[model samples]
Target: EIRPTIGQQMETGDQRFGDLVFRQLAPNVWQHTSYLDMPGFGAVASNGLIVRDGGRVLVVDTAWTDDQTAQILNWIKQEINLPVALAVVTHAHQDKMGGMDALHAAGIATYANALSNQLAPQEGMVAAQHSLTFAANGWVEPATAPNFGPLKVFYPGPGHTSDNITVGIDGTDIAFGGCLIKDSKAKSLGNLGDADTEHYAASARAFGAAFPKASMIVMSHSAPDSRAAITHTARMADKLR
Candidate 1:
């Protein structure tokens, strides 16, 4: 069944891409996971968030491919009976923005931070045409919060990448930490070729301070957990130093 208990991972049953899975974290909040073949990591899973507000849906990040994104959109439409109004790419990485073309083809507005837009093309990924630039200090509240529900974006310095960002849902107090945060069981930062290890811990600390009330923090490649994501990153930062 599509409906799953909170924290239970459910398979999406896409035979072609059998690795896809999703879990409901809270009312109107869900996490979708898809696998990608990384250069050295073999098969790795990535995550994105879905928020349903009223009759509109906000996709926090795109899956690994256009076809995967299409499956997510179809599932959202069937389950919620609503159209996806907007999507935000948490960073420029493929796992984050790979579905941009699909989203645009479907006429959904897609956005990424200015840095992400600039760096994406350099990484062989298309830069999102639309921009949602944050302030000089790296944080901005939605100009029209009511229009997109209660979502805010923050940069928190730089960890996974110079353009990495976190999406905070005010109503649910959950933060989609992207690759900047780590899972509780993460022994080390998963991938750091593009990461800023020198400032990673401090950035994560700033992020935690920014959202002190976040009850859940969802990492891009790990299971969702509270505080642990922040704590693990901090410890890793110390060890890496």
Candidate 2:
């Protein structure tokens, strides 16, 4: 079982920003957590994934701010000793794309789905410069899974957000479900202001069917879990509706 310890510390250069911690969950896969003030939720933490493939790294989601995103980039360079090749914004929310401008300014390519691009700007947030426009049913060919050598992007469907996506590592079968899947301890669907409740469970069911072999699941705002997390989320969504 993989356990996540909160409030872990990393070497700090900026005191204004919360401590950014990187915890190794599996070989070459890490969970990065950063803190920020979220409206209606008070002070909260957001999570992302770091996949180090050879000398290159892929960041799944950005932190809450550009400064924190820069800090993460610096930590990756100084501590992990790998150059960040690109970043994938899992959704249009601030916690996922807030660091987009920072990464772009640092010359790192960032990408998101077209729906996110369409919605983000309406929310007064900058959209990712690069985009993967999925079809009406949200389908993309496996060959075009945003090749980072070993990492691939998968869109399960709309749950937490219409544009949420997951990142999977080929050999490891580990999937980052972003905010679409919930943690084991999650009581409700959580932050569903932008969610499609009618189709939420169906989307999660699709994710389960698609990634049935995924042994470890990483969520965007909580600890990682086994495949049971998907079932838990589906059940919660069913009951909540």
Candidate 3:
């Protein structure tokens, strides 16, 4: 009873606050809003993104529960015939990787930074025991991994968490910045409770440097429309430095 209603809200709402909505944002890029509500601790609660290219689905960050996972999977089934080929965990946070088991079951290759895999086991264990408590939101970890079609997962530095990776689709201008970039109006980079401020800034810079040809930046939160957003975040990181 409760489940059906939630699913409907996700499909119908314009800008969903609690339910998950999987929509194509650009040419081959798609966005999945998570099940968790907003006013989340320092940032909004949501899955990062999913990019499909060349008949392959590349999932960026998985969401927080079995329900959210199911919703995203259903949407994928409706949109494309190909199964997810790869699942990328942008960071070690549970909100990002709690759904690994499901994706793996679907025969999707799950890739993360070596550090992220190490940290995920510990974080997943904690999330399994207790939902993450952030200000007004309590989120349960997803018991499965999100399936993907074509995914490229790369980890270069430490930002947002001890193990943060930037997911970039090959031959596409779009790149998932994870929690690394901050809005121009942002007063300060978020603490994240587990991040090292210095490393976070350095990591962001390194990421930008690594992608010399990237023209579009997709942040985990906030909207990504212009190259300015990426430029602004880079400048902000410099200011903090």
TM-score of 2: 0.87
Taking the candidates one at a time, how many backbone clashes does each contain? 0, 0, 17
Model 1 regions lying over 4 Å from their true place: 1-19, 38-42, 141-146
TM-score of 1: 0.88
List RMSD in Å for every model shown. Answer: 4.4, 4.5, 9.1
Cα distance off (Å), candidate 2, residue 201 = 0.3
**Rank by TM-score (best first):** 1, 2, 3
Indicate which candidate wins on lDDT: 1
Candidates in order have lDDT scores of: 0.78, 0.76, 0.58
For each candidate in turn, the TM-score is: 0.88, 0.87, 0.73
Which candidate order results from sorting by lDDT in descending order? 1, 2, 3
Write model 1 residue lDDT over 1-241, tens digit each, in one string: 2222212244443222234676778889888877766465356677898898887999999998988888888878766779888988889988899888889899988878878888887877777767766675668646622265666788888888988888888788798888888877777786689888888888888888878899899888777787877987888887766
**What does candidate 2's lDDT look like per residue over 30-144, in tens digits?**
7788777546645566789888888899888999888989888887876679888888888888888888889989998777877788899886668887777555455545544
Winner on TM-score between 1 and 2 is 1
State which candidate has the highest TM-score: 1
lDDT score for residue 37 of model 3: 39
Query: Between prediction 2 and prediction 3, which has the larger TM-score?
Result: 2
In angstroms, give how far residue 65 of model 2 lies from its true place: 0.3
